[PDB]
Amino acid sequence: AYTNSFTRGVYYPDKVFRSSVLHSTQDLFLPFFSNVTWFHANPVLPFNDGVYFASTEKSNIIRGWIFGTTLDSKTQSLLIVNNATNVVIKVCEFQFCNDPFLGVMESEFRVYSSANNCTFEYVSKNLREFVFKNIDGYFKIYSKHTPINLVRDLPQGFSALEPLVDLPIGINITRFQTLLALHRSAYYVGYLQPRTFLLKYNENGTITDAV
Amino acid sequence: DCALDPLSETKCTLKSFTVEKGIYQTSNFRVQPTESIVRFPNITNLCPFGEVFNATRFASVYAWNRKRISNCVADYSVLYNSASFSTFKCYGVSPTKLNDLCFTNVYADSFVIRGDEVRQIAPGQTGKIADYNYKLPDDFTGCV
Amino acid sequence: TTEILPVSMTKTSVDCTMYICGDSTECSNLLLQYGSFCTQLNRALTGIAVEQDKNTQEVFAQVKQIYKTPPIKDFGGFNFSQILPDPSKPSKRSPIEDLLFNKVFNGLTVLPPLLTDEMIAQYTSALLAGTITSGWTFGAGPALQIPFPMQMAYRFNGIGVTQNVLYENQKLIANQFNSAIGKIQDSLSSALGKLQDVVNQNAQALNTLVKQLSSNFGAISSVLNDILSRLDPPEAEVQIDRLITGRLQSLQTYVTQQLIRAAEIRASANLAATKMSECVLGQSKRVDFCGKGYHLMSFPQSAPH
Amino acid sequence: VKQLSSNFGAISSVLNDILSRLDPPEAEVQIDRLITGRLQSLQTYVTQQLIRAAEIRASANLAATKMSECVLGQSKRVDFCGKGYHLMSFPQSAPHGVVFLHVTYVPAQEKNFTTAPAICHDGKAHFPREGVFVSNGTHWFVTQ
Amino acid sequence: STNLVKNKCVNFNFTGVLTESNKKFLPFQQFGRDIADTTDAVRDPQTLEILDITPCSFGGVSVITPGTNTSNQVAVLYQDVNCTEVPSNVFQTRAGCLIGAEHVNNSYECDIPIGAGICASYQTQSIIAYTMSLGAENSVAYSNNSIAIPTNFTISV
């Protein structure tokens, strides 16, 4: 199935504070009214020019995402894992399976089998928009956790994704997949495009509206 | 004397010795903006230059390794006073004041070339190195 | 009927060195090579700043005395309460005037008009008090007081119609005038685009002048603290000079376009002066110079500029 | 003229100083600087002369109209050929212009009397043909 | 270097007076800017608060002289500058600060134009300032039936 975004994926290009102005910018912005691939809980999707990821769920089913070129060994692969504890980011040559997921006792973790050449290692309803972007080896993640009143459906409204983590690792991301929690006891994929956006700000610095 | 009193400054502005009645803009008043202060969070460290500089060996121009040496005190003043490096070619920036200059991220493309192939690598000038081995773009903002 | 006539615009002053160098000695020393471009610019801007005030004085200052209206006001049928100065109002202005004024960084400075809004309001109150009480006599010498009905009989004779026509129709001409001034308030409230346009033009020109201070023009940055803090003086000259040429060009363009706008505000102010002389200080037989129809009388009211 | 002695970022202000101690190849790069500068200044002069001519033109046009209407006429227009009531004008020349002598009539020494627009008599209403009805305190009189 | 120099035109290494603010931010904002990329505020890099960076104080300087053929006394106007930060007679005008002219309470015809209704004259010894006179004052004798008529006259040129 396919769905129509309305005004979604409009993150702050970056920081500096701006009061009520109409600063027109030009960055990788999901074009207004785009065709978001409605997925349901998955196959490997291309990364191309950045990935928009709206997740409409209450219980944690989206348990992180894998990223990389060949998504395996020989080439490094950025794994972002999310468990009952916290987030584990790791760029190593892994051995991702054809179906990389985790079970739910709570016996989980089937994603990969190997973890060689580990360069980077980090350890620590509700609509969760995510914007991924690897410009110049900088994996700038953007996030918007806006609680919805639906279940797994894309709502109508505006959201300014606030910049989250930036990984200066330098890994070729040409493909990506989604790690999901299976049962032992729906997301949306969009692609950002170079788009000129008249960003209307607020006195508190918030992108309240855009054109 | 154009600095005695407002009338002399008016004469000097008009280039005359007789000023007739009117009102004349004569100069500007600018409150002193001094006391240059630094609120920059001190990195209070030391960038290991010698490590990525004169090491036991280096790499070739086909497999040059760019080392990210950043988030430390970039002391280029010690590099300048040591002057143990024949060439410094700082293209894009100044190499004398590179110590105080604060960048966000610095690289270290490590490789060896010949004395005739040391000129080949250049922002613009192409050759066996800058078109086949190690290419230096025209946006070079560092120091060879 | 009404008509809006812009008489003045804003008087601005630019500090050449402060717009181009921004307090930097290296830039200031390179600027000296260009000779006296900055002097000619200040001269041109002072030369338009002064004439903006001259426009004001030649339009409104056409009275020697400050005329006042009688306390008891019986004008034989004409009630002018909406265009007379009100004491409980801001700046002792008239009700109509109220509606009119409600409807419409780096070496950059705006100079105040020599004349305040209060004194323009008093000039109008003087002109108004003179015309409602002495007719056109105060615009040729002594203010000979005449009854308002008699004054309206003379303007009727002036358009070719006999006096008896006004004398037997006093109460109807009275009501029609009052009703026609009654519509002006609403017609204006629902108008002064002429005035809004000159303000909008001056604003956009200032905004472009400031926005030009963030362009390289073929340099490596737009900050003088990014060519002196990032490069040795020898090579800095070949990047400062670029910013210099570009900022000089933009400043010259602004001043040339301000001279061209000033020439047109001058023409508008000159027509306002001629018309005050022919339509409030007298009765014009000119077809379509003071309204559509047979001119009887005019009344000036003030607007921001 | 005083602009002809600025370098504009050149090395002297004389063209017999730039072919002169310098050599023809490097001379272009210093002559062009002078050329750009002098062209700019000449253009600025010419634009400002256009802007001044546009105003001398309006002045001359008003002079033309007024000679039509105040020498060659008598003007009923208020405050166009003097202040008061226009009687006649005379022109006199001036170096780059014309002066006009405005001869006007001004009333003086007023006396307040009582009036009325109309007189009743024999059941009829009479209105003055070209005057006003004044009173000396007793008899009523018609005046201009 | 040192700590916050609040309210001082200072060259900062995060120039301008370091006034403060009460604005908010979104968890990441670095500095602060506005229309035409004007640094009007900043997410203070250290104490994470908002400070308004007002440009330094500046203004033209105007010299009023009655003429060297009358006197060599001079008055000075610092244009749209508050008269407390200039470095007798100091007088505050809607057009800036005036030094060297005393303010009088009469009103004459305008002689040397300062602004905002204010003119200056070499009358009252020294330079004086005042709010100019629109003109004198003529009253009227309007009733409802009374006329005035001129008896003599004058020819003027």
From Swiss-Prot, chain A:
Q: What is the effect of changing V151G?
A: In strain: Omicron/BA.2, Omicron/BA.2.12.1, Omicron/BA.2.75, Omicron/BA.4, Omicron/BA.5, Omicron/BQ.1.1
Q: What is the effect of changing N172Q?
A: Increased resistance to neutralizing antibodies
Note the effect listed for F109L. Answer: In strain: A23.1, Omicron/BA.2.75
Q: Which residues are glycosylated?
A: N35, N83, N117, N172, N204
Residue limits of the BetaCoV S1-NTD domain? 1-211
Cite the effect that the entry attributes to G103D.
In strain: Kappa/B.1.617.1, Omicron/BA.2, Omicron/BA.2.12.1, Omicron/BA.2.75, Omicron/BA.4, Omicron/BA.5, Omicron/BQ.1.1, Omicron/XBB.1.5, Omicron/EG.5.1
Q: Where is this region: Disordered?
A: 103-116
Q: Which residues pair up as cystines?
A: C92-C118
What's its job? Answer: Attaches the virion to the cell membrane by interacting with host receptor, initiating the infection. The major receptor is host ACE2. When S2/S2' has been cleaved, binding to the receptor triggers direct fusion at the cell membrane. When S2/S2' has not been cleaved, binding to the receptor results in internalization of the virus by endocytosis using host TFRC and GRM2 and leading to fusion of the virion membrane with the host endosomal membrane. Alternatively, may use NRP1/NRP2 and integrin as entry receptors.
Q: How does it assemble?
A: Binds to host ACE2. RBD also interacts with the N-linked glycan on 'Asn-90' of ACE2. Cleavage of S generates a polybasic C-terminal sequence on S1 that binds to host Neuropilin-1 (NRP1) and Neuropilin-2 (NRP2) receptors. Interacts with host integrin alpha-5/beta-1 (ITGA5:ITGB1) and with ACE2 in complex with integrin alpha-5/beta-1 (ITGA5:ITGB1). May interact via cytoplasmic c-terminus with M protein. May interact (via N-terminus) with host bilirubin and biliverdin, thereby preventing antibody binding to the SARS-CoV-2 spike NTD via an allosteric mechanism.
Which protein is depicted? Spike protein S1
Q: Which organism is it from?
A: Severe acute respiratory syndrome coronavirus 2 (2019-nCoV)
| Originating gene | S
Which part of the full protein does this chain span, and how long is the full protein? 27 to 289 of 1273
